[PDB]
Symmetry: C4
C-alpha cells in the first residue's frame, strides 16, 4: 500500500511520461487555436484534451498518497494542486475563463523539468528585499491616484475617473507609454498646470525603480555575503 | 513632577493610534472616490475627516513641546507640520486649490512607521553624489532648450514656442515618448535637418543618464 | 604546394588586401542605394560585386586547402564560409530572394579583424548562462499567446485570436511599445478585465529581464571575485 | 612684455569674474529667448552680448601667450576657443544658424569649473573603452539600413526610401519608440514578414546595449 506504490511514482520515465504528456497537450493547444486544424481533426484534440487531463489527476493523487503531509508543504505541488484542479471544474458549458485557465497546465512543464525550478526560484529569491520597496509604491499611487480623480475626473473620466481608472492611468504613465502626447498634453490643454502632477511623479517613479537595481546587488547580495562566503 | 506630558507622546502605543488613525483617514478619502458613496454615507465622512484634523493639530502641537532640540530640525515633523497646516482651510486672501493638497497627509503612514522610514532614507541615501550631474544636465536641458525655441518657435509654437514650452518637449524626447513621428518626423518637414539636434541630443541625455546608473553601484 | 599557399594566406598582405577589399565594398554598397547612381555608373559596381565575390570564393578554397580541418571547427570561420557561399548566388534572375542577404558579406570584417571578435565574444559569452531562461520565456509566452487567440481574437483579428498574431502583439507589449492606449484600452472596452492579462503579464515579463541582466552583471562580477580572494 | 600678465590670469580672481559674466550672459541668453523681452528691452542689451564677447575674445589672447604651444594642446581650452569664434558672427551673416550657435558659449560653465571639468573626463573616461563597441554597431545599423531600401522603401519611401531614411527609422526602432504600431505593423499590410527583419534586429540591438552597460565597470 506504500512500497509498490512509492517506487512507481518516483520513476525515471513516468516523469518523462507526464513530461511526455505536458509537452504533448501543449502542441494540440497550438492547433486547437487555428480552426483550420480543428475542423479537420476536431474530436481528436477535444477528447485528447480529456484523456490527458486524467493521467495528471492520478499523478497528483498518487503523489498525494506517497508524500502525504509534505505534498501540502510544496508550493510546486500545491501549485500543481492549484493548476491541475482548476481544470477539474466544468469549464465546458460555462464561463469563458476556466476554459482558458485550464491552459495553465503548461505552467506544469515549469513544475516538471528540474533546473527550471531553481532559476524560477532564483527569481522568486528576489521579492523579500523588494516587498519593502513594493509597499512604499502602493501608497505613493493610492495618494497620487486620488489627487488625480479630483482634478481631472469629470473632464477626463476614461483616464482618471473612478480611482481604479486613476490606477490604470497612473501605471501607464509610469512605464511612460504614450504619456507624453497621449495623456499629459491633452490634460495640459484644459488644465495647463497638470505637468506639476506628472513630471515629478515620473521622477519619483523611475528614480525609485532605478534605486532598486542599485540595491538588488547591494541589499540582496549582502545576505549572500554574510553567511555563505565567510564559510571560506 | 513637572512636564508629565512628554511620557505619552513617546511610546510604542501612540503610533497604532495615530498610525491607525492615519490609516483610517488614509482610507476615507478613497471611498470619497465612489460617487455614490458620498451620497448615502457622506454624512459620517465629512466629520470623520475633521475629527482627526484637530486630533492631528492636537498630536502635532502636542509633539511640538516634547521635542525641541531637534523638532523644527526634524523635516519629517515639519513635513507633518506643513501637511497638517494646509488641511485647516488657510485664510490668506486666496482661492480654492488646496482642498486637494490635504490628502498629502496620508504620506504620514510613512512619516511615523520606521519600515516606511528606513526606505525613504535609502531613497535620499545618495541623492548627493548625484545632485551635481542633475545640475549639469539641467544646464544641458537649458541650453538645448534655448536653440530649440531659437530654432523651431515660429513654425512650431505648440511644441516649442517659449522657453517653458521647449522644456516640456525635450523631457518627453528624453523619456522618448513617441519622439520620432510624434515630434521629429514633422519638424523635419519645414526643416529637413532637424535630426542632428535629436539623434545627438538623444544620446547625450541617455548616455549621461546611463553612466549615472553605473557610477553609483560601486557605492 | 602546401607550404607555399600557406605563405599567401595568413600573411600581413592578406590584411592589406581582404579587410581593404571588404571596406571598399561597404563604401560601394552605400551607393547601390539612392538609385540615381545605378542608372549612371552602376555597372562598375554590379560587377565590382563579382571581383569581391571571386576574390572571396577563392579564399573559400585557399583556407580550406591550408587549414584543411582547422577551418570547419573555428567559430569565426564557418561564418565567412556561410557569408560567402550564401552570397554566392545568381546575380539577378529568379524570384529574387537572397539578393538582399548578400550585404552580410560586410560582416566579414568582424571575422578578419581580431578587435571585433573579442567584443562579439564579450557579448555572446553571456548567452548560455541564460539559454534556459530564454526558454523559460518561450514557455511563458506560449501559454500566453494561446491565451490570446482564445481570448480577444474574436473581435481583434489584427492583434490576436491566432497563435501567430498574438506572439507578436505581446512582444510589442513587452517592450511597452504604444501598449496601453494603443492596444489595451481598446480590448478593455470590449472586455474591461483585459488588464488582468497585461497588468500582470507586464510586471512579470519586465521582472524576469531585470533579474536576467542583474544576473549578467553579477555573472561577470562573481568570476572576478574568486581569483582575487584566495590570494591578495 | 611676454611674461607679465600671467599674474592676472593664474589667479583666484580671474575665473569667477568670467563665470559671473557667463552666468549673467547665461541668464541674459535664456532671456534672449523671449517673444517680448528681446523686442521691448533686448535691443538695449543686444550690446551686452557683444561687449561680453569682446571681453571674452581678449581673454583668449593672453591665455594663448601664457601657454605658447600649450593652449591648443589642452582639451577644455580648445573648446571655448572655437566656441567663441562661432559666437563672433557678424550681426548679419549668410545663414543665421550661427546666431543660434551663440548659446554654445554658455558651455564655458563646464570647462571652467573643475567639478564640471573632470566629470566630463569621467564621462569620456568610458567612451574610449566603448569605441570598442560603438563601431561594432554603426556597422550593424548600417547594413540593416541597406537591406530596408531594397525591401521596404518603394512602398514606404518616407521611412526606408534611402539610406538616411533607414538610418532614422532604425535608430527609431532601437529607441523602441512607437515602432510596432507606428512603423512595423503598417509594413505588414504590404510585406508580411517585415517583422522577421525587425524583431531580432530588436534583439541584436537590444542585446548589445545591455551587455555594454554590464561590462562598463571594466572599460
Ligand atoms: C526644479 C527643477 C525641475 C525641472 C523640470 C525639468 C523639465 C520638466 C518640464 O515639465 O518642464 C515644464 C516647465 O518648464 C514648463 O514651464 P512653462 O509652462 O513653459 O512656463 C513658461
Ligand atoms: C524568443 C522570441 C519570442 C518573442 C518574440 C516572438 C516574435 C514572433 C511574432 O512575430 O509572431 C510569431 C509568428 O508566428 C507570427 O506569425 P504571423 O504574423 O501570424 O504569420 C505571418
Ligand atoms: C548611432 C549609429 C549611427 C550614427 C550615425 C548616423 C545617424 C543619423 C541617422 O539619423 O541617419 C541620418 C543620415 O542618414 C542623414 O540622411 P537623411 O537626411 O535621412 O537623407 C535621406
Ligand atoms: C527581448 O526584446 C526586448 C525585451 C525587453 C526590452 C526592454 S523594454 C523595457 C521594459 C521595461 C523598462 C525598460 C525597458 N527598456 C527601455 C529603454 N528603451 C526605451 C531604450 C529597454 O530598452 C529594454 O530593456 C533594457 C534594459 O534595455 C527590450 C527588448
Ligand atoms: C474587480 C474590480 O477590480 C479591478 O479591476 C482593479 C483592481 C482590483 O484587482 C486588482 C488587480 N491588479 N485593482 C486596481 C489597482 C485596478 C486599477 O485601477 O488598475 C489596475 C482595478 C480597477 C479599478 C477600477 C476600475 C478599473 C480597474 Cl482595472
Ligand atoms: O496556422 P495558422 O496560420 O492558422 O496559425 C496558427 C496555427 O494554429 C499554427 O498551428
Ligand atoms: O518662461 P518665459 O520665457 O515665458 O518667462 C516668464 C517671465 O515671467 C516672462 O518675463
Ligand atoms: O536652417 P533653417 O534656416 O532652416 O533653421 C532651422 C534649422 O536649420 C534646423 O533645425
Ligand atoms: O470574456 P470576458 O468577458 O471574461 O473578458 C475577458 C477578460 O476581460 C480578460 O480578457
Ligand atoms: O513578403 P515578400 O516576399 O513580398 O518580401 C518582402 C519583405 O522582405 C518581407 O519582410
Ligand atoms: Ca507612442
Ligand atoms: Ca511608447
Ligand atoms: Ca519607448
Amino acid at each position: 500500500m506504500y512500497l509498490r506504490i512509492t517506487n512507481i511514482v518516483e520513476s525515471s520515465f513516468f516523469t518523462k511520461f507526464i513530461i511526455y504528456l505536458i509537452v504533448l497537450n501543449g502542441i494540440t493547444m497550438g492547433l486547437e487555436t487555428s480552426k483550420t486544424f480543428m475542423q479537420s481533426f476536431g474530436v481528436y484534440t477535444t477528447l485528447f484534451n480529456q484523456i490527458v487531463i486524467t493521467i495528471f489527476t492520478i499523478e497528483i493523487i498518487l503523489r498525494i498518497y506517497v508524500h502525504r503531509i509534505s505534498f501540502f508543504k510544496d508550493p510546486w505541488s500545491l501549485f500543481d494542486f492549484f493548476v491541475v484542479a482548476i481544470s477539474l471544474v466544468p469549464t465546458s458549458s460555462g464561463f469563458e475563463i476556466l476554459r482558458v485557465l485550464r491552459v495553465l497546465r503548461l505552467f506544469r512543464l515549469v513544475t516538471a523539468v528540474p533546473q527550471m525550478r531553481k532559476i524560477v526560484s532564483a527569481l522568486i529569491s528576489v521579492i523579500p528585499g523588494m516587498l519593502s520597496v513594493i509597499a512604499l509604491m502602493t501608497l505613493f499611487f493610492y495618494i497620487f491616484a486620488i489627487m488625480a480623480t479630483q482634478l481631472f475626473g469629470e473632464r477626463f473620466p476614461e483616464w482618471f475617473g473612478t480611482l481604479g481608472e486613476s490606477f490604470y492611468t497612473l501605471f501607464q504613465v509610469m512605464t511612460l507609454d504614450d504619456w507624453s502626447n497621449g495623456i499629459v498634453r491633452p490634460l495640459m490643454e484644459v488644465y495647463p498646470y497638470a505637468y506639476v502632477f506628472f513630471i515629478p511623479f515620473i521622477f519619483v517613479v523611475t528614480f525609485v525603480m532605478i534605486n532598486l537595481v542599485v540595491a538588488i546587488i547591494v541589499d540582496a547580495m549582502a545576505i549572500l555575503n554574510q553567511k555563505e562566503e565567510q564559510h571560506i
